[PDB]
Amino acid sequence: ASNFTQFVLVDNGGTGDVTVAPSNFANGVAEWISSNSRSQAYKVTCSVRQSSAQNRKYTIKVEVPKVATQTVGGVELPVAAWRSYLNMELTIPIFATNSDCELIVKAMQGLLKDGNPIPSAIAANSGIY
Amino acid sequence: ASNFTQFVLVDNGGTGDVTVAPSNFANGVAEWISSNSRSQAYKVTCSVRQSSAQNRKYTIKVEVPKVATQTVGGVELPVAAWRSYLNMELTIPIFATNSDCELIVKAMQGLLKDGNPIPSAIAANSGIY
Amino acid sequence: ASNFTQFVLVDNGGTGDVTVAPSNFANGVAEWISSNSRSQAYKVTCSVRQSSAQNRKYTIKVEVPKVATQTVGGVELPVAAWRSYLNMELTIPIFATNSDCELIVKAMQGLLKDGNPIPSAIAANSGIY
Amino acid sequence: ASNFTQFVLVDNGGTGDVTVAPSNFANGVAEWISSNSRSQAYKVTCSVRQSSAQNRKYTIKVEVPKVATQTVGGVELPVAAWRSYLNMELTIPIFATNSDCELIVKAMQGLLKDGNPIPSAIAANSGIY
Amino acid sequence: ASNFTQFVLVDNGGTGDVTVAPSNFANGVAEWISSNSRSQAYKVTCSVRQSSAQNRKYTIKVEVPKVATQTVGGVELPVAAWRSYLNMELTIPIFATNSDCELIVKAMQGLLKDGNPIPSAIAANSGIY
Amino acid sequence: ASNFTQFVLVDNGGTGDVTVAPSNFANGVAEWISSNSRSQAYKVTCSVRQSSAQNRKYTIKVEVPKVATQTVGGVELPVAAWRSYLNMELTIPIFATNSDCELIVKAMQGLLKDGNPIPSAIAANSGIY
RNA sequence: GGAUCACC
RNA sequence: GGAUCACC
RNA sequence: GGAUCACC
RNA sequence: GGAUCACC
User: Fold this and answer.
1) Is the C-beta of residue F54 closer than 7 Å to nucleic acid chain H?
2) Helix-then-strand count for chain F, H and E
3) Is residue A120 less than 8 Å (CB to CB) from chain E?
4) Do C95 and E26 touch (CB under 8 A)?
5) Which of C36, C75, D115, E81 has the most other CB atoms within 10 Å of its CB?
6) Measured in angstroms, what separates residue C74's CA from nucleotide J1's C1'?
7) Where are the alpha helices (DSSP H) in chain C?
């Protein structure tokens, strides 16, 4: 194995899927960027550290760009009009079994499943009510 | 709509699924917890607010219990040995349309989809290699 | 080659052997862990660097769990009562050829071979007498 | 018994084996040197101490010399062109059974077995990748 | 997936090829060293950093040794009589798409292609004329 | 005889090839520029000097432009939206025979050969991982 | 807390 | 700029 | 961390 | 070290 592989970040149903691929592991921060100019690329980073004697902490960041073409000095440059940033930190005790861990993964997957409260709020520029 | 409803957090395939239900709404912060003692419950909370003039930020927090060797209803100390804490912060610029937001949700669903690098590392008590 | 692969750490003769597999590579430090919670796992890490102008140094670290009376997946405290820590540092002058290095490995295999003074003392909770 | 016996440090297959024999136990540091001039001898030292109220710590050092004959002042002297130093410290809790200890020994033996990642890297002047 | 693997630095037909293998990835500086004595080995290092707001900057270094034996007072050591040091810094704006980077790469390969002015001047201890 | 001639810097099959032609050899600095507007042209410079008593030092520089049109107030000019700058310095002791220099050259060609770590990282807007 | 996001 | 080459 | 390796 | 790249 090697879990450092590419994957589809945005599954747009076979066409216009956004796949992100490995691009750097300097300083122990695993990085993946979409196949774009670095100014318009999607980026995902992940790093794990023993945040304490008894915890391990994963730090995952995702940047979703809104691409544009800005005219600077009379010249057109590929640019990102804005960026949406996701920052997540997961602290897991060292006493967690592989099954305990799989439980955390499933909880995170269910949280964002289509139709559930949270992804429905975000997608509608609303809050939970 | 009205999205503060009960949902399935851990899908164990119809049998032994973990449902989380509304439990508090003080301060506009929606809270959902599982049917357990608060020390052993699955807890999810979510709130939105405008972090700055240019952004809106969602703060989602999840607590997952260490289930292996757990004594249901018992007093388990130290608390930090028996719980995992997830903390997500999603920053979205005020220009993001509903469409932009749906894509942001897709990017999040993709990152955690089964079989991708990140969920596989977490689930296997691993980092990236 | 490509040597960051899974291997058998504890050979219990084909049955109940302990295999340790790649789990992290942040900072060029290869890590291998067994299939357990991180508190009960067998862990091995290895890195090389040039310690000085004249030497290269390998830093190998191993953690072995106290298995007698262990509760698989349980929370066992204090951590220091349930784990043994091995720490090896191998310093090799830049003049050592591959041949010189093979002999150095043989010297290490010899020291720990079954039946010699050192492994026998360790295994019997003894010193030298 | 008396585990303070001689042993073959480098098994060169019956011919040119490097056997190391007991040579000193002053100050509680057990020593073994190869049958050479003290300037060209292989040396192994071992000492155990109750590093703490609840630990015991073994300190093992091995020196592998690269022998030469240096001409000092117009005279030839048996000398070591350089030395490779191995330093290992093993900390074992006092709660470790003899079987727990045997497990540590096997882990150390498997680590260095021919063909496994670590001894393969060292022997090839390479790192783990 | 990884690009931190071994590769043929010098292709001398299929035999007498110089293969450089990964050795250390400390502080975002990837290092590859050829086998045998570290003293006579080839070395390649590479690192990338964001040199400024719009630029990323690669720093590649290569050392080619002149393999020789040093005899001093009758003790001979494997040394490098001397070394050539190559230091290249490639600056690339963040507006470069992957297509642009492939072009930057073909330009570098062309500069050094056999028969072109530059590699011919170097191979002949000459300058431009 | 001269090595100050034109050459294909970028080989795009046999068409869309970038040819750089001699332009100026002032002060021991050879310069080659591609055709058309000097503003959108490629540039290669090379010079050799005796950096020290035992060394000679080559300084090669290459600029790859991003061809674009600048419109300002209705007046459009042929410009380069931006440029990548390559700066390489090759140091070679005066003891190097022609054979040694040919080896230094094959090492440079190999570093950048297609598929090897370095040219692959660059062509993909990536680092080492 | 916050960001322009491995940063303050 | 120079190096003994991730230093100066 | 480091060594010339029971040392700093 | 940085560059707008034989400059700083």
Assistant:
1) yes
2) 2, 6
3) no
4) no
5) C75
6) 52
7) 98-111, 117-123
Which nucleotides of chain G are near protein (any atom < 7 Å from a CB)? 1-6
Please report where in the chains the tokens 């003899």 appear, as a residue. D98
For residue A48 the two structure tokens come to 């794990």
Pairwise CA distance, residues B120 & A105, whole Å: 9
The continuous run of DSSP H or E covering E87 comes out as strand E75-93
| Cβ contact D110:C11 at 8 Å | yes
Residue E113 · residue F10 · CB < 8 Å: no
- Pick the closest to residue C92 from C60, C61, C58 (CA basis): C58
C-alpha–C-alpha distance, residues A31 and B56, integer Å? 26
Contact C122, D105 (CB under 8 A): yes
**Look-up: residue for tokens 């920053």?**
B91
All residues of chain F having their beta carbon less than 8 Å from the beta carbon of residue E2 are 129
CATH number of C1-129: 3.30.380.10
CA distance C47 to C61: 9
Q: What is the DSSP string of D67-124?
A: EEEEEETTEEEEEEEEEEEEEEEEEEETT--HHHHHHHHHHHHHHTSTTSHHHHHHTT
E35 touches chain C (CB under 8 A): yes
CA dist C123 and D3 (Å) reads 12
End-to-end CA distance of chain E, in Å? 46
Residue with tokens 């490779």: D84
Resolution for the entry shown, Å: 2.9
The single-letter code of the amino acid at A29 is: V
Q: Which of residues 23-82 of C touch strand I (CB under 7 A)?
A: 49, 51-52, 54-55, 57
Q: Which nucleotide is nearest to E45 (CA to C1')?
A: H6
**Chain D CB contacts of C121 below 8 Å:** 3, 46, 48, 58
* Joined tokens for residue B83: 């719980």
* Cis-peptide into C22, omega within 30 deg: no
Q: Which of A77, A76, A41, A47 is nearest to A61 (CA)?
A: A47
Starting at the earlier edge strand, list the strands of the sheet with F55-72: E7-10, E18-26, E29-34, E43-49, E55-72, E75-93, F75-93, F55-72, F43-49, F29-34, F18-26, F7-10
Q: Is B51 exposed, middle or buried (0-12, 13-18, 19+ CB in 10 A)?
A: middle
Residue E80 at interface with chain F, using a CB cutoff of 8 Å: no
User: On the CB side of C119, how many CA atoms lie within 13 Å of its CA?
Assistant: 21
The answer to whether some atom of strand I lies closer than 7 Å to the beta carbon of D45 is: yes
Chain-centroid distance of CA E51 in Å reads 21
Q: With touching defined as 3+ CB pairs under 8 A, do chains F and D touch?
A: no
Rounded Cα–Cα distance for residues A9 and A31 (Å): 13
Peptide bond into F65 cis (omega under 30): no
B24 strand G contact, CB < 7 Å: no
If one counts every other C-beta atom within 10 angstroms of the C-beta of residue C5, the result is: 14
**B91 to each of A61, B61, C100, how far by Cα in Å?**
11, 15, 57
CA dihedral B47, B49, B52, B54 (to 10 degrees): 100
Joined together, the tokens standing for residue B114 give 């089964």
E124 contact C CB<8A: no
Cβ pair B60:A86 closer than 8 A: no
- Owner of token pair 């695993």: A30
Cβ pair A103, F95 in contact under 8 A: no
Task: Name the method of structure determination.
Answer: X-ray
Query: Can you tell me which residue has the tokens 């960027």?
Result: A33
User: In a 3-state reduction of DSSP, which class is residue D39?
Assistant: coil
